[PDB]
């Protein structure tokens, strides 16, 4: 299903690292590893990479220039489904739900993918 | 891969439970589910499950009689990777490693299978 050290849910692979970059390094070791910061498209996947992740905060794959929605790796428009709280332009996981802040700050981050 | 709910690792699949029972009641439901109580078989498969598992402690499917060995569900000799600490019987996983309780108290538990 998955590469080893990575964790499947939902016919999916997630990546959760062991070191701290910014937003956009995040993306690019995602990347090179054919992989995106995690997309948190379900509901389930938010609460799994919850409580999979631990007390670190991680960064996810949604950003947004200053008023505009979240957007996804790709560039469209993210389905609202759970709130993203703060004021960030990066999204990113705290211990409880998902939050926001300056993307050039480092934080560990996860990587997703498919099987 | 896994069914739904259900978390896969290592080729592997685990259930982890909302409710608490004792740990034959947590094996008996397990196996009506064609599971087991997890075998902690890999030191990783321990690590993963200590970080998905959660705050509460959580039935595992080793047990022993009072001097003896930790005996796997089927009756067999665990080779004895990581401690298991405590003199319970039952083996459980607290937050951070493996320790052992009464068999009759009540707790969360967690089900191994395959894919
Ligand atoms: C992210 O950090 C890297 C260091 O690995 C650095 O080259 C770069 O300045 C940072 N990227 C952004 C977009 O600030
Ligand atoms: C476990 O609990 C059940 C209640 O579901 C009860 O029938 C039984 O007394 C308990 N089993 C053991 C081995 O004590």
């Known amino acids: 299903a998955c590469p080893e ?3 499947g849910f939902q016919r999916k692979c997630f990546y959760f690292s062991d ?3 910014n937003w956009t390094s995040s993306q690019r070791f995602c990347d090179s590893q054919d992989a995106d910061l995690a997309q948190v498209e379900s509901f389930q996947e938010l609460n799994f990479l919850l409580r999979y ?3 670190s905060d ?3 794959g949604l950003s947004r220039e200053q008023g505009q929605p979240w957007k996804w790796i790709n560039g469209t428009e993210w389905t ?3 709130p993203i709280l703060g004021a960030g ?3 990113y996981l705290n211990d409880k739900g998902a939050s926001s802040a300056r993307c050039y700050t480092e934080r560990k981050w996860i990587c997703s ?3």
């Open 5 to 7: 050290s990575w964790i």
């Open 19 to 21: 070191d701290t970059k």
């Open 53 to 55: 992740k631990g007390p």
């Open 58 to 60: 991680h960064w996810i």
């Open 80 to 82: 609202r489904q759970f």
């Open 89 to 91: 332009e990066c999204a």
């Open 113 to 115: 993918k498919s099987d």
